[PDB]
Symmetry: D2
Subunit: 291 residues, 4 copies
């Protein structure tokens, strides 16, 4: 089951597409619906015709309906430095270093992984909506990541593509500015669908691809496979929920491995495209904030 | 106007006490009520007898009613290193240092202050309720702070006492563990009231006092005045709201200056008392989390 | 307990006055509150000062608050011809008569009493609000009645004064026009309070008094005691609920004995005052409907 | 557009069927949807497959879904003696008569028609649900009628089949018992659909057919056309709304012309079938009330 939501005349409608192309309109709340499918694979609703899912991915935006965030995640959390060579996060001399070793390569080795609060639902956007660059950021990058939808017990309800938009220049300036660099209006994008757990046989065998498009020009292209992930997801979830209750429908984003250069910073009207196998391609335009 | 809330048989009731001891039961939502008083100093409700405010502060807990969080703040944010000598936050050789200067004494000097996400409402507790020490923390300290209640425009609606409970050992281990050290169940306490802006003539002239009580024993006592605050509140608010929309009733906590030693770590059944002039005294028992 | 409601800036507030003059602001819904007092005589709320109940009865209407319908009764039902000499309801030759005996004097004798649907809540008005005379009625009279508040099981939750406003000329024209004569906008008034069952020792010993006031002039005055009621209330309730479920807070009005003459018909700007012992006096101005 | 509702696992879903057999699942409230179609003939929703409307009419009741009342009418009103020869309503000597002429043949002639309150929504049932015979009624008949759905201005939003279930023996006993004979649990049935105004070209040219089925046996069969209606619907609506506000979705039932005999009274387990051209056939089992 691949799950998506549209906004129509002020109200939401949620639809699920099956492997045989049949589209089902949902009766329940999408988060409630994912929790159901997790237990017994049951879906409540009616089969619908005249809903062009493929056109929605391309155009947005057809007649009356517009695709958006598939769910409203009550909390979005992030997990840092889970990949090979992710330690070199700003290799300039010098960043923050404890006993000669940098803070980022410390966490890569340490038992306890990095976990940070990323966004509230109203700070998130969906497929076809604009992500943002802070007014006071000269170097902001998109971070293409595999993200999991969780229940209150930390059980994986599904997978999605997430863009952890990071004002990298503020982070490099001082690690204590990380929250300012990560948490703002339009700092987070996910979609276009949330695939159910059974739609992906192996989460550690998926192709993530980033493309930044500036006036038709491919400004950056890079891709990495999930087999390069060292810190496993189950461990990230374990440290997330420890003494820390999360609501149903929490999204955890698993960290990035595709890092564009110092010159590849985002600017107004850019088009960020992220592709993950079996899920789809998330396309979000970029909007530079005015001071 | 000094504003407080009680829970009674599953439902909330909000009361306001005036300077002449008269107590008013509120008609509106407390956050909505603070926004009103901010504009024209109007209070909607009836004067009530038989509500013993002084007994509520001491006992909790009288007949049918129990004092709790005065409001439900949709978001709680924190501001770090705003005081003199707050730079020495773990002076051990070495913590995180950029170009020989430590990250904490960098922020003290830098134009951009430290701002971090602290808690969601359900992670907060009130007067007489238990704060928590993480199951995996050997050194957790309370941080006595002056806190402001804000509207969506960043206007100060009122003041309160806040305990920013911090698992200091995890922070010292690596600054990237800060979110884990700060954000958890029972990580935050505030109250017992929210005083309106006009109840404090000068916010930079208030006595903050910390007391940790272990089996009747005064385990720690320290106090500092707000005149020692270098980073002004208006500046902290400015950087909080920048490209970052906050809901009505957001609490910002302004940073601490009272820091107990390495030996003064919290443990089960402790009693943390925090006093700020004109506001009152916040008393919260301590509960150690089981693994 | 004597229960009343006020409207204040678009919202309702319910208050209860006790025998020792102490006034309590209610926590619960008034219908829910009456059901509670019926079981264990418990009242949830706070004692309030500055609520001038006596002034509310006279003026309406003080500062911010206006008295209105004490509850919103989901259904209002009526019971006809329960009094001595009520058989002579329009003695003119002739009204509707079966086998030489008139339909009204038939019901007075018959095992089965008269029960009719009277109003929906939005068709009812309260103390100080305007009752109405239909645009096509030349002879409309008020019917001063003792009314009971019922739960779904038909248990008496309390007593109130009710005005069953009846377009008597339409009824006399044809008994099948009774629903048109009884059910319309402003066809029903009750209040000013609902007294709890224990406030009246004997419901069959109460003085009901009607007064129609035209420009300061006492246009009609009449009064009768409830000891003149032949058809008992418990029997009226029995036939009401039979195969007919009623919601909680249903009002049953027990029939009238004070009937003004053919010349004493109501007209615009009249003042109808109804008094019942231990309850109070219900005052409603009259408003003639335009065609 | 022909509109119907189903109940599924505790919640309602509304569907519309078009003339070309295409079935649309509705986005809006059915009453809100009828008001829309009345203004511009616009329908909000998605075309659905796998909803077997024809099977729903026969079986009820398929898998997960059960047909019921197409809407929840806030008020149901009735209009009496609108047909030829309807004057002979119980011709026995004697019923209620004014000046030698019977009350029923008076209303047939009089300018003012008969209008009565019939039911609240919770007293109504739908296609496939049980209608009721009062525990104290020895002669109860179904009254097959054309019914209109109205808005607050008295505009016709659509048509449906309605059964005005009447305890005829109580009415014959005394006309003042009419409310008891008409208003009770399961006193009213309508459906199976509500057809939009444009689905019927001429409301005064429709075949209404009654069938009472006792253990497979056709116990009664009778039918009459709407061209035999003397009192027009527009006039019935006019007298309904006069000084009497009705909510959106009010149903008015236009009176019957098919009257079974004194021996044809209803009893337990009977099957009452009513057919009106272009609308469908309403089938409701009968359930005798226990004392
Ligand atoms: Ca990231
Ligand atoms: Ca702090
Ligand atoms: Ca009456
Ligand atoms: Ca009828």
């Amino acid at each position: 089951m691949k799950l998506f939501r549209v906004v129509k005349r002020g109200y939401y409608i949620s639809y699920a597409i099956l492997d045989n192309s049949t589209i089902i309109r949902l009766d329940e709340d999408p988060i409630k619906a994912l929790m159901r499918y997790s237990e017994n694979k049951e879906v409540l609703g009616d089969r619908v015709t005249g809903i062009d899912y493929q056109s929605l991915l391309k155009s947005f935006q057809i007649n009356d309906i517009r695709i958006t965030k598939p769910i409203d995640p009550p909390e979005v959390w992030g997990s840092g430095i889970s990949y090979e060579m992710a330690r070199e996060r700003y290799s300039e001399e010098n960043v923050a270093k404890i006993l000669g070793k940098t803070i980022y390569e410390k966490v890569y080795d340490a038992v306890r992984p990095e976990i940070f609060f990323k966004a509230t639902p109203n700070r998130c956007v969906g497929h076809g909506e604009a992500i943002a660059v802070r007014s006071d950021s000269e170097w902001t990058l998109p971070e293409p990541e595999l993200a999991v939808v969780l229940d209150s017990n930390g059980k994986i309800l599904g997978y999605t593509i997430m863009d952890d938009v990071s004002a990298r220049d503020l982070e490099a300036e001082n690690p204590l500015y990380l929250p300012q660099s990560k948490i703002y209006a339009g700092c987070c994008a996910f979609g276009p669908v949330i695939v159910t757990s059974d739609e992906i046989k192996n989460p550690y065998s998926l192709d993530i691809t980033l493309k930044i498009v500036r006036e038709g020009r491919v400004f950056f292209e890079g891709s990495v496979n999930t087999n390069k992930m060292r810190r496993k997801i189950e461990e990230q979830i374990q440290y997330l929920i420890r003494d820390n209750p999360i609501p149903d429908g929490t999204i955890l984003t698993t960290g990035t491995a595709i890092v564009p250069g110092r010159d590849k910073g985002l600017k107004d009207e850019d088009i960020v495209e992220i592709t993950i196998s079996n899920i789809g391609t998330l396309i979000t335009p970029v909007k530079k904030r005015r001071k």
